[PDB]
Design a protein around this nucleic acid. Structure first.
Ligand SMILES: [Mg+2]
Ligand SMILES: [Mg+2]
Ligand SMILES: [Mg+2]
Ligand SMILES: [Mg+2]
Ligand SMILES: [Mg+2]
Ligand SMILES: [Mg+2]
Ligand SMILES: [Mg+2]
Ligand SMILES: [Mg+2]
Ligand SMILES: [Mg+2]
Ligand SMILES: [Mg+2]
Ligand SMILES: [Mg+2]
Ligand SMILES: [Mg+2]
Ligand SMILES: [Mg+2]
Ligand SMILES: [Mg+2]
Ligand SMILES: [Mg+2]
Ligand SMILES: [Mg+2]
Ligand SMILES: [Mg+2]
Ligand SMILES: [Mg+2]
Ligand SMILES: [Mg+2]
Ligand SMILES: [Mg+2]
Lengths: 102, 203, 147, 210
RNA sequence: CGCGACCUCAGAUCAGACGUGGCGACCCGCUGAAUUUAAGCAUAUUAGUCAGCGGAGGAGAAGAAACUAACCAGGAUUCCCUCAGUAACGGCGAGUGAACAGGGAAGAGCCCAGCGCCGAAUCCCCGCCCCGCGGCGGGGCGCGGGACAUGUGGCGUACGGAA
RNA sequence: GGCCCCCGGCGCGCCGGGCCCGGGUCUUCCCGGAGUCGGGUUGCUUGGGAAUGCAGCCCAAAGCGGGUGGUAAACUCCAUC
């Protein structure tokens, strides 16, 4: 019953039709490429792991995974980086465990 | 291509391989003078991203820099003054060590024109660096159009004026809210603008 | 015009209008707003009640344009439009009522001071008062929200 | 010391400001210099507009300015793409192009395509040599004008659409604006908690089953 | 126990180039007070100011968003007007103190590394000829040297690019 | 207003070289700068306030990541580079 557009409240603002353009090429940066992935993990079997990483793997093995994160946060810095690292380490540890079982 | 590999390896600096090498390099460098001209770039990869090119008239000095902060050069303590300024020990230089490294490479080779530097290791006592230099008057640079900007005499002593990538960083200039000081040319210039009585004709 | 000023008339007299018991010394009070608490307190707290002390909430990155909302009163709403809209109306005989886009004229809010003449309107505006709404309806008009 | 009533006022003349006073005795001499330099630049870019390139129409930001419209920095790529002007060429015919402009709404886009279309209509591209190939216009529209355009090229004029007198249907009259606004305020305010309590209630209904 | 590659290093009044000091009104990088104000004073202020050192150019610096915003959105840098003596800081005292938007002056945008393709397709120096030579260049011709695969040149760089 | 010098700048001709240099449409591929970011810190700095910027020292990354989004943090959507 009369829906005037308002300058204030939830579905607010001037009602205008939206174009749905191609997203800028700048926005795709950091997207992991097939060839870059190969390079990345090709080097993780040359260079191997860091010391703090290794220590965290040993915690994760024990299933003491909060203490693992508490350690990684103090080491890396942020929570979000620490959490993302802990998942990688848990993935690595799993693919070792799958590789051993054969 | 090999460069991408090299690049990714060098990021694994805590790795067993690169740690071994860095220890051996850093030992070796420590056993030489504070400034020597490397025959080729320790880090080929990095040098290319910074703008080295493996042709004549590009040079690379490896320069040592003593590490840690900056104690206030005053006899005994005796920074006579208000006890705000009593500090001598825990205070820290504006420019980086890497800039100091370039500045020294620049000082030494006056003809040479500092382009850019990169890191090659660190002991407790020292850091090590590798400053890419360029002859502005070697024909291969002069005649190459893409470099011949360095042969212009505004680019004399970049490192001394705070103009290499490294010595840029101390100046504290970037776009956006996290700056404002340096919202003219530079830190000094904004202050200058902000503390001018503009006194107009008509008022 | 020095000619007109007071120092021309003080020439000859010793003290230059500053007296000779007490003199014209440099800064007998202290410089500027010195002594707001001590020794100038009475002036501060009988002509500037509430100088000293904090109050209310901080607001860090204030940007004024967010809170931009220039108001207009019913008082002079018809001023926004040409007289011949208010004239071709109280005439016409269709019961038309002309539109008044207030946001065009540069006011966002419509508040409600004043008597509105008995003559229908359609007021388009970003915001309205309660009273401004009511008065508008009483004239025989319609408030209209716009983004 | 303050004496009986006045603004307890803070002047900023405690630094050595007289060392940095900036007089304006230039300004007339300046104003001329610009003006000469301006007339020279016209004369150099001979039949080309003195203005510069053509520039897009663009709305200001913020609630405040919002309603007004300026010249922008340059036409977006989509606007050039739709008009059908190759971006690298557009610079060569006096069309400003920025490429950092997004393009959110299609009302601002079609307007700015329309601008370029109109420009291309009333543009007189001279041929490279006096011998005339394609694109280059006729010697009629050339002799009749190798004329400069004074002022900004195709100027933007912020314009209003006149609303005719309606009749006020019993529905407009029915509306309760002030109330509506108060409601619309509170629902933005309370949206979020309402959703949390409903999420709570949904969990209680599922918890009742188990 | 020689000869030969390269690597890392020396020495030459080796061939040919450059750098050194000055000036310093303006400019860039560091360094950095204390008188002073607060009616005392120590934080604050004076002030990132004087003095100190460094390096420039006809201007310098900055500059083509890891930006603003939160709009129906703007779109490199610099400059002016405004924002604004405002938001903020502060023995919340003295005092200090920006930015976005808006209007103008001006207006211009680009290139690598990388990723790839192309017989290194590239560069420097020698020496002989023709022109040109008071800003050492063009063209040709040399099994004449060297740089370079630990990567030169063409295409190409996020506004996408290649095939 | 004149004449004479010189120099600049732009117009035409000839020669010597270089230079076989587009765009859209559909498909298949290609894609990013590390002791850096970020964190902790201490010192200076800022209007920037549970850190505006620069530093030393220690830690020390990622790739639908990273940075920003002016009150510390977790979860979560968006926006923006
Ligand atoms: Mg003090
Ligand atoms: Mg940094
Ligand atoms: Mg008197
Ligand atoms: Mg006397
Ligand atoms: Mg007295
Ligand atoms: Mg203009
Ligand atoms: Mg000198
Ligand atoms: Mg005192
Ligand atoms: Mg006193
Ligand atoms: Mg005293
Ligand atoms: Mg200060
Ligand atoms: Mg000085
Ligand atoms: Mg410059
Ligand atoms: Mg940049
Ligand atoms: Mg801006
Ligand atoms: Mg005011
Ligand atoms: Mg200050
Ligand atoms: Mg390449
Ligand atoms: Mg301070
Ligand atoms: Mg917040």
């Amino acid at each position: 019953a009369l829906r005037y557009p308002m300058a204030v409240g939830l579905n607010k603002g001037h009602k205008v039709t939206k174009n749905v353009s191609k997203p800028r090429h700048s926005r795709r940066r950091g997207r992991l490429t097939k060839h870059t992935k190969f390079v990345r993990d090709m080097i993780r079997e040359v260079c191997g792991f860091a010391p703090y990483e290794r220590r965290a793997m040993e915690l994760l093995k024990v299933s003491k995974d909060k203490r693992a994160l508490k350690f990684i946060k103090k080491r890396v810095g942020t929570h979000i980086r620490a959490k993302r690292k802990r998942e990688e380490l848990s993935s690595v540890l799993a693919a070792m465990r799958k590789a051993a079982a054969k | 291509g090999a460069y991408k590999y090299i690049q990714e390896l060098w990021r694994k600096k805590q790795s067993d391989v690169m740690r071994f090498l860095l220890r051996v390099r850093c030992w070796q460098y420590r056993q030489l003078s504070a400034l020597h001209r490397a025959p080729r770039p320790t880090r080929p990869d990095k040098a290319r991203r910074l703008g080295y090119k493996a042709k004549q008239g590009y040079v690379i000095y490896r320069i040592r820099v003593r590490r840690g902060g900056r104690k206030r050069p005053v006899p005994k303590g005796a920074t006579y003054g208000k006890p705000v300024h009593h500090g001598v020990n825990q205070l820290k230089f504006a420019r980086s060590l890497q800039s100091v490294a370039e500045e020294r490479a620049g000082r030494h080779c006056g003809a040479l024109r500092v382009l850019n530097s990169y890191w090659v290791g660190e002991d407790s006592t020292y850091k090590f660096f590798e400053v890419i230099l360029i002859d502005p008057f070697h024909k291969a640079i002069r005649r190459n159009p893409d470099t011949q900007w360095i042969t212009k005499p505004v680019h004399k002593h970049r490192e001394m004026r705070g103009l290499t990538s490294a010595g840029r960083k101390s100046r504290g200039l970037g776009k956006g809210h996290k700056f404002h000081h340096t919202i003219g040319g530079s830190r000094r210039a904004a202050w200058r603008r902000r503390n001018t009585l503009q006194l107009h004709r008509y008022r | 015009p020095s000619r007109l000023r007071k120092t021309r008339k003080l020439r000859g007299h010793v003290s230059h209008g500053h007296g000779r018991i007490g003199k014209h010394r440099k800064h007998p009070g202290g410089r500027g707003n010195a002594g707001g608490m001590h020794h100038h307190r009475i002036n501060f707290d009988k002509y500037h009640p509430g100088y000293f002390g904090k109050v209310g909430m901080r607001h860090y990155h204030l940007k004024r344009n967010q809170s931009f909302c220039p108001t207009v009163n019913l008082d002079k709403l018809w001023t926004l439009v040409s007289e011949q809209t208010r004239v071709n109306a109280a005439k016409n005989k269709t019961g038309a009522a002309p539109i008044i886009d207030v946001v065009r004229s540069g006011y966002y809010k419509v508040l409600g001071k004043g008597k509105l003449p008995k003559q229908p309107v359609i007021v388009k505006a970003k915001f309205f008062s309660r009273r401004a709404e009511e008065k508008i309806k009483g004239v025989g008009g319609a408030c209209v929200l716009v983004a | 010391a303050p004496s009986r009533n006045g603004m307890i006022l803070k002047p900023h003349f405690h630094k050595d400001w007289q060392r940095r006073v900036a007089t304006w005795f230039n300004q007339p001499a300046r104003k001329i210099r610009r003006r000469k330099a301006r007339q020279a630049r016209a004369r150099r870019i001979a039949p080309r507009p003195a203005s510069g390139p053509l520039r897009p129409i663009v709305r200001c930001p913020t609630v405040r300015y919002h309603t007004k419209v300026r010249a922008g920095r340059g036409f977006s790529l989509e606007e050039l793409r739709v008009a059908g002007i190759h971006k690298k060429v557009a610079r060569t015919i006096g069309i400003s192009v920025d490429p950092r402009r997004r393009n959110k709404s299609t009302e601002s886009l079609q307007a700015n395509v329309q601008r370029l279309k109109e420009y291309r209509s009333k543009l007189v591209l001279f041929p490279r040599k006096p011998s005339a190939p394609k694109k280059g216009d006729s010697s009629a529209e050339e002799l009749k004008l190798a004329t400069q355009l004074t002022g900004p090229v195709m100027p933007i004029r912020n314009v209003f659409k006149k609303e005719k007198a309606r009749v006020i249907t019993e529905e407009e009259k029915n509306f309760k604006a002030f109330a509506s606004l108060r409601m619309a305020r509170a629902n933005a305010r309370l949206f979020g908690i309402r959703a949390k309590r409903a999420k709570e209630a949904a969990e209680q209904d599922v918890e009742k089953k188990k």
